[PDB]
Amino acid sequence: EVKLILYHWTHSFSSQKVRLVIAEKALKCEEHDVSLPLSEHNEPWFMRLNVPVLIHGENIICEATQIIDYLEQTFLDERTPRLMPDKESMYYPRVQHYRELLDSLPMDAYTHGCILHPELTVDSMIPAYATTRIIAKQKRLKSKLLDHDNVKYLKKILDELEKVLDQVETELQRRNEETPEEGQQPWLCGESFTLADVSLAVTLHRLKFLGFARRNWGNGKRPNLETYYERVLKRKTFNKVLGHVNNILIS
Amino acid sequence: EVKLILYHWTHSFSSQKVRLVIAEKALKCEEHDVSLPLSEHNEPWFMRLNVPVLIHGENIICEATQIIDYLEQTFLDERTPRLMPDKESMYYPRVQHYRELLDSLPMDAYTHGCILHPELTVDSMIPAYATTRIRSNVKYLKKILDELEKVLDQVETELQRRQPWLCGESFTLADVSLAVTLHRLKFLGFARRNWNGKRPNLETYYERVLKRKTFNKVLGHVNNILIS
């Protein structure tokens, strides 16, 4: 067969979505984790949060959204699951809507703003010493201003994250209303696991890692979202691909 | 050792710049031509003239302009030739200009203006049955071609002020962009239209790189439609 080759960083947010798609679609892929256990400065992966590429025959595709679009387009065997409904379907506008809504979130800024200013996280899974590493009065006020602006920005996107999850919460509430409690529960947009679901699951898993989870769900807040998360953690594909991607004890 | 991997199409314009940079820097690279001789629609490589990627240890770099930048920044061993002067040197601001101006040429438009509207081509190396196949505007084509006349006008004058190469004594990244660019223009048939009675020092510049050891090794026969 025409080999599928993927170069990626095991712990990068974009890599996680690609590898999960490959697993949802049951595709055979020669996956190369180019990341090292120890860096040139002898630092583990959780201290280095800062694009993947697919080679399939004559095609070379970079960036995760493009790779996944390529996979959904080219692997059309009847046994291969589709993660998107047909373009002429009732459901396509809704799946593409939430997929874009979640793929638009500034995850890089959430992680950068977690290492810096960890006082806005709760139960962050990154060690606290990651924050410590990362006359002249002109500079004393210079750096105070950059901190003031960096926080004003971080707080702003965290408020924008809440409003995105509010829609997801409301959407998941519509599914809970439409589904008997005794029976198979649907996913975000329907009975089928879609690309909107991989973007949501991987996003939530990372917000958990950054300590931005208790702020947004749990202890009565967004119960449908909490249920959705504890469920995808049990999903066989998710656990195999991402089961221990938040475990800083594993290299 | 840390391996240097490149996935590329041999006959891609951008890939040619990358592979030439690698050879000009004397870097051991495992290069994978992922292109096939015949497509599923049974077309040779000169029909499908419609991004490369470099893997180096923990690094993955895609677009060609970025691959070349990564190579110039990373392999700083004294035995590795530099294709770019220091960023605070007197000579950097000019090399970057010609580099950006050459890298800004619409090579995709030229190629499709060669297949289509072959009347504006002279000694096009693409067989004529590509024009018949692809047909199943000349206004915009003549425009970008005349824009090219103006860009080449700048290159001709810089060559008078000079053996050395385009910007200075050493072979630089402005040279690969110029060399690979001209070489493609010849393939497309736009070589006589722009230089025997016109642009003499450029004709000497183009004829000189063709004899260059490294250029001939990597691009000696990228214009030969008989080779896959």
Residue numbers in the entry:
A (entry chain A): 23 to 72, 77 to 160, 186 to 302
B (entry chain B): 23 to 72, 77 to 162, 201 to 226, 236 to 268, 270 to 302
Lines from the paper:
GDAP1, a 358-amino-acid mitochondrial outer membrane (MOM) protein regulating the mitochondrial network, is highly expressed in neurons and less in Schwann cells. GDAP1 contains two domains similar to the N- and C-terminal domains of glutathione (GSH) S-transferases (GST) (GST-N and GST-C, respectively), a hydrophobic domain (HD), and a transmembrane domain (TMD). GDAP1 functions in regulating the mitochondrial network by inducing fragmentation of mitochondria without inducing apoptosis. Although the sequence identity is only ∼20%, the GDAP1 core domain shares a fold similar to canonical GST enzymes.
